[PDB]
RNA sequence: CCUCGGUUGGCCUCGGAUAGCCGGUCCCCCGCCGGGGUCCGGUGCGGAGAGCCCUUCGUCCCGGGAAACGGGGCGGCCGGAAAGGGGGCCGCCCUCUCGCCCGUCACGCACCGCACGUUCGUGGGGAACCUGGCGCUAAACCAUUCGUAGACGACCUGCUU
RNA sequence: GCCUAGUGGGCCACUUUUGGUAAGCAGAACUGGCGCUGCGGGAUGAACCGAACGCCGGGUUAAGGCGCCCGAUGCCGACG
RNA sequence: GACGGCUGGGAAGGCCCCGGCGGGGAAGGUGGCCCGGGGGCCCCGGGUGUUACAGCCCCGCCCCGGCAGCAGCAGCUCGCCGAAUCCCGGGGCCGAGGGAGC
């Protein structure tokens, strides 16, 4: 009945200064501001949910406009709780700053 | 007006570092920003500890500025700081933070239901007192 | 949770009189294991409640056998639930994330 | 030397290689404050090559061991006699410190010289470090802690953990 | 959804760095009371810094040259813009997520304002170092609405005191209500005390 | 019906000081309940943003607790301009004793392990058809003219008491 | 061992070094570079620092860095 | 998570003046005593001085005194390690090859 995903922000690609590697995304999870707190989320699955114009099929449902790039968390990034995630398709750069749902179910506990 | 002074015998509360959550006795000061401390009853070895990580408490032991750990423990167990520290509101609002940290999901559900009641029972009598003020202000 | 099945799937029921969750399989990597527990040592799980029993067959109706097995496990596990207070309502509730409540901070 | 981390004091004992002229050479002991024993042995060969006509090739080191403090729980005053090169000239100094370890005192001296005089560890030579009693100290920043009933507050407690919420409602208290 | 920050007592660049990072991470930010922002250094030093800013103009067409805004809101806005990559679409959207104000306007005066301790003057400056006021600097360089902002701010503060006195009356009524009903809430207070939500 | 998409509970608010604060209090001293001296507590802020509020699987029986002064809803008064209050309150001819907690009692698509679920959402924008009421029946520009104006546009003027 | 193209304008830097007041000047020695060569870093950049390159995935580094632009200290970093 | 080696065959430290019996010492001088003033006997100043109504430092063995323990149960007072070293768990990436025979 309620929300089951953590909120994260597509902060950008894995990058140096002048070379960005689009295949790896940098997530900022709400509530994670240290690298010690990142250990829960490593390996968890992450979803970029977005709507488009033409309908696509929904698993266990009728076709609607929502579309998903699936991914999962690979490792932490830096001391301040930012995280590296890898998605099936590289995330569109229009999603930078926008929301990624971090699911709870590669459960380890 | 300062009340907490770094002096020989003040119990300090260690905020961070490896001995956080514990109580030390300030045995001597070394320089501007470091003191030889010693916790002989809270399991802290006698060591240099910076001032920025200790938080001063309202408890002052009396021992000399070079007396050893056993005289420090004599003063500590004569003043019974293990129970007087626990009797303060400081340690109670430390352990309340610990209990809210150790809350389980069933604990959070029971807290949610009990608070759900307590807020409504207070909230009806708050408005009852409010209109008992307006009906008696005229 | 009651018993691990032979394929590693978790045989489970939070009772149909509380959850509308029947005798059913779940997966351990897709469930969260909270540290609240009921002693089910005296609970006779039927021996035929296996993965061959729980496998999808091929327009779905509960069979009479599946109707009576849920009763045969509920009539035993429910007095153990109702002997610890507020757990029936706890199971009736669902888990949800709200503002400020973070999963790396919440201990279950 | 790059004065990395807490220094350690080493007793380094060395000698020449025994020639047919000198069948057993005299043995020289030096206290070296160094990050580790490799740097300690290198500074030993620096100082012995400066004092005697002895090189690493013509000599050997028979001992190199870390010398632990006999009272690391006791607050002591330390007198350090210093030789260093500025940008113009070389100066003798004497400085005073307060610590529990003489290695902590020497590394405090090295960072203090780097602060006050912009002098790096390669230009600084320790000559003598001695634990001095409190009556024989010459520096008032050390001597002001020579009080039995010493008493000071911590006046303006700056908020560390500046990013624990990063966005709080309540402005902080700095009085405690 | 909006991060509303009281600009009083903050340092300009520290607050602007944190605000720039938040509007890049996609959070709408409203910084109210921008005349209360402090700048480190003495006032004459800061005044001549903005006077050196004013001396810069396009020599052939100053109407095309650099726009020296005088309001403290727009000066803080310009610092965040200089901290943002404003010549790209992500930068322009980041800037458009940010609102800046002088005083505390009617959308945000009935709202709680956040404070950033990592940007505060009392935390980030030694108490003996001299600071400056953005409102005074702004007024002395050409902002005209300092006095009327001050009058509207005291008009807002005198109503905020009314709201505060009523809130205190409600909370003392809350405390009398707890001591009234402490017989029929005692079996529910113990739950909140054993799980550490009260004492 | 298209289309634009983001989002997935709210915080409805002292002023501020930081070598100091916060809340109560009268036996006081001043003011139009507001302020200060006195006293009492609190202060690693628990009259805590390390916070607060809400907290939802739903329905059926019967019991206890809490409520009864309550819950839901038509006629009046206060409250707002810096970018204006959708709130509190007065009664009404209505209805219920349900809502919240602890229990008794069973029920429901139990869809047979699986993903975009769950909101803000009668969202914004766009056209269109229904379907009832209250209404309202205009200017701009050209053309003509003027010369306070003018390269041309533009500008300033007039054209049925 | 034969045949053999291109080249026979060079330039820069540590150290040595001649003329010149000096020069992003003119002239030598040694070695390494640039030319012939992208890449990380020095904001920018023929030559500096790191390092030389098939097309990719994971990991790790060098030199540089880690308020925000802009990846990285959002360490309750140390001493001045 | 557990084990072990080495060192000054760790240094310090812990317990039994609370190690025993002696001998001294001085100060960042404790009791006392004297002076001075600040309160309702107490506290803070200044002086004297050697244990007393705190402590510190230097047969110390009266079998390295006797015990714990030992590079120390935090998940920190200071190391170098591992033939004197092993167990357990988690996250990520990948599955090249395709007649090995018995
Ligand atoms: Mg030349
Ligand atoms: Mg030339
Ligand atoms: Mg060429
Ligand atoms: Mg080549
Ligand atoms: Mg190259
Ligand atoms: Mg440069
Ligand atoms: Mg080089
Ligand atoms: Mg790679
Ligand atoms: Mg940089």
PDB file of C-alpha atoms (C1' of nucleotides) and ligand atoms in Angstrom, chain G residues 57-60, ligand 8:
ATOM      1  C1'   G G  57      34.279  -5.497 -19.561  1.00  0.00           C
ATOM      2  C1'   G G  58      35.893  -5.691 -14.371  1.00  0.00           C
ATOM      3  C1'   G G  59      39.663  -4.071 -10.954  1.00  0.00           C
ATOM      4  C1'   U G  60      43.859  -0.808  -9.679  1.00  0.00           C
TER       5        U G  60
HETATM    6 MG1  LIG I   8      39.244   0.064 -17.267  1.00  0.00          MG
END
